[PDB]
Amino acid sequence: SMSRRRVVITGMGMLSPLGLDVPSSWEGILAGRSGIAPIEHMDLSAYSTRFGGSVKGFNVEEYLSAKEARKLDLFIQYGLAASFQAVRDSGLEVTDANRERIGVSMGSGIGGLTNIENNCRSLFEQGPRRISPFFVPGSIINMVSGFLSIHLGLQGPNYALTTAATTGTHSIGMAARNIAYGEADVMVAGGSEMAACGLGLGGFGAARALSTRNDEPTRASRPWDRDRDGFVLSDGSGALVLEELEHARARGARIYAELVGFGMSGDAFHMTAPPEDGAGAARCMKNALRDAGLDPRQVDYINAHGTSTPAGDIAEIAAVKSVFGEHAHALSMSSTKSMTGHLLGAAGAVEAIFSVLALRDQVAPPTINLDNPDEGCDLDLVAHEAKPRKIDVALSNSFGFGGTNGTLVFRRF
């Protein structure tokens, strides 16, 4: 704990509704662009929600051969894309000397819902003889970590989290712990999701979790706005190359930031709804700050969970107020879900990247669509437009079904 190794971010990668890499996504974020649109090439006329954030124009053949790619669900494709981008971005070379010290932890919330839909259809219409032989290996959540390790020869710790909307945040935090306690020197960590099929929209629609603002998809995700009506379902991926500091310094790696804190908590409250005061979120953020050895006054920017739900958004404000007190009125906090929608198991991965870039570029991304902040939402929520400011420390929150909570703390380096 006092003798643990320090962990830095040397590589990043992303597919989002705003772009096919980190630079293009971030340009969208800093412009206040929505990635949400009507979902195409899919007949959603029966569904109460017919829009979301899709990854537009993705070519898996930049990362995999066609033959390899056809084995895999889109969530795996997306996770490999972000991973390969992050590894490349890191400049790391995998050798016989280091391959056992490099692991992977790429998770998903829902996994291969699209493959399950297609295979279920084949099963019901034709029978079990039309199930793909790649159905199981190409749809299971740990096959990002698995295929990444195969393709790059990674022999270190190899696993996958699934903690709903918290997955990406946990995947990064726990990979950092791996490095900090010397179980690995490098980890590829993050997550991916592709739930914009009928089971996903249908499932989340039946749970009454989604916005139904079909007439104005770009206005649907509106965190802390009084006309919010639930979250927007989005697809994509994020990956970070985490690396022990001295390992990174020794090879002259470009270091984007230091991952100084990781906190976890459980609400122990409700399956899908938070406690109204956000007490689990508060405990989680405290754990993270204490983990980082930071005073709350050192936090400059919070990338909120901020999913555009009635209860969730207000609970998150209550938690930030509780943890930060008067300093809650000094920091900036925004929800990039206003633009990206909710990427579920990838949300914390892409939001970790946006947090790192906020530190790099000294700029708080906007919460777009925040026209009439609800009762109690009186913080600097960066309404409408990106805000240049001093950011030495950034915090990223994720909260998921089951009351599972994760916070990461990043520090300028």
How many CB atoms are closer than 10 A to CB 163? 23
User: Which residues have C-beta within 8 Å of that of residue 165, sequence separation ≥ 6?
Assistant: 109, 305, 307, 342, 344, 345, 347, 348, 398, 399, 400, 401
User: Which residues have C-beta within 8 Å of that of residue 87, sequence separation ≥ 6?
Assistant: 11, 13, 152, 188, 241
Q: Given the rule CB under 6 A, which of 58-66, 249-257, 295-303, 398-406 is the region that contacts ligand UGL?
A: 398-406
Please choose which of Cl ion, ligand UGL, its own copies, none residue 296 contacts, taking the beta carbon within 5 to 8 angstroms, the exact cut-off set by kind. none
Q: Given the rule CB under 5 A, which of 112-120, 187-195, 361-369, 376-384 is the region that contacts Cl ion?
A: 112-120
| Position 315 contacts ligand UGL (CB under 6 A) | yes
Q: From its phi and psi, is residue 32 left (phi > 0), alpha (psi between -120 and 50) or beta?
A: left
| Position 272 contacts ligand UGL (CB under 6 A) | yes
| Position 281 contacts ligand UGL (CB under 6 A) | yes
Residue 122-151 contact track with Cl ion, rule CB under 5 A, x = bound: x---------x-------------------
Q: Which residue is nearest to ligand UGL (CB)?
A: 312
Please choose which of ligand UGL, its own copies, Cl ion, none residue 333 contacts, taking the beta carbon within 5 to 8 angstroms, the exact cut-off set by kind. none
Q: Report in angstroms how near the CB of residue 396 gets to ligand UGL at its nearest.
A: 13
Q: Cα–Cα distance between 285 and 265 in angstroms, integer?
A: 9
| Residue 298 burial (10 A CB sphere; 0-12, 13-18, 19+) | middle
Which 3 state secondary structure label does DSSP give 6?
coil
| Cα first-last separation, the chain | 21
Residues 244-303 that bind Cl ion (CB under 5 A): none
Q: Report in angstroms how near the CB of residue 123 gets to its own copies at its nearest.
A: 6
Q: Given the rule CB under 6 A, which of 233-241, 287-295, 305-313, 358-366 is the region that contacts ligand UGL?
A: 305-313
User: Which residues have C-beta within 8 Å of that of residue 76, sequence separation ≥ 6?
Assistant: 112, 138, 139, 143, 144, 147, 192
Residues 148-167 that bind ligand UGL (CB under 6 A): 165
| Residues in contact with ligand UGL by the rule CB under 6 A | 165, 272-274, 278, 280-281, 307, 309, 312, 315-316, 319, 399-401, 403
Give the residues lining the site for Cl ion (CB under 5 A): 118, 122, 132, 216-218
